[PDB]
């Protein structure tokens, strides 16, 4: 392959194009590269901020016999994002904890458990 021989086939250049490659890159290498926009460090992932009885009505719909400790923090490979409050919202790690902090500021009692740190 010409990509192996380090040939520049870019279309604006020689008119050609490299043969083994996708025709549409939904995100190019640069913004795949930037992990800060993707992973969650230092960044809010749930944008809507709910009122008191909003929060209480959200908690109202979590099924009994549910603990927080059973929802693992997803790997770095996975995008960090939240849908707001949707069906089975408590299943989304980021939504669950974001909500938890919203409840903390609001003085809303938090019915679910808390995150357990297992140790050898």
């Amino acid at each position: 392959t010409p990509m192996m021989l380090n040939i520049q086939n870019m279309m604006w250049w020689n008119g050609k194009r490299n043969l083994y490659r996708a025709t549409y890159r939904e995100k190019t290498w640069y913004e795949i590269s930037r992990t800060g926009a993707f992973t969650k460090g230092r960044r809010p992932v749930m944008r809507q901020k709910y009122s008191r009885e909003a929060l209480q009505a959200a908690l109202a719909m979590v099924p009994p016999g549910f603990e927080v400790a059973d929802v693992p923090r997803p790997p770095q490979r996975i995008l960090a994002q939240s849908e707001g409050i949707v069906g089975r919202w408590y299943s989304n790690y980021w939504t669950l904890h974001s909500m938890r902090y919203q409840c903390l500021l609001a003085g809303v009692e938090w019915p679910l458990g808390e995150r357990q740190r297992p140790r050898t």
């Binding site: 380090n6 040939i7 520049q8 870019m10 279309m11 604006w12 250049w13 008119g15």
Partner: peptide, 22 residues
């Protein structure tokens, strides 16, 4: 490609073919 051309110094636009079509 033994040595590559400097392609970063060009804005991306298609030049006209020198045996230009009529």
């Amino acid at each position: 490609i033994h040595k590559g051309w400097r392609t970063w110094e060009y804005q991306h636009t298609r030049p006209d073919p020198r045996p230009f079509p009529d």
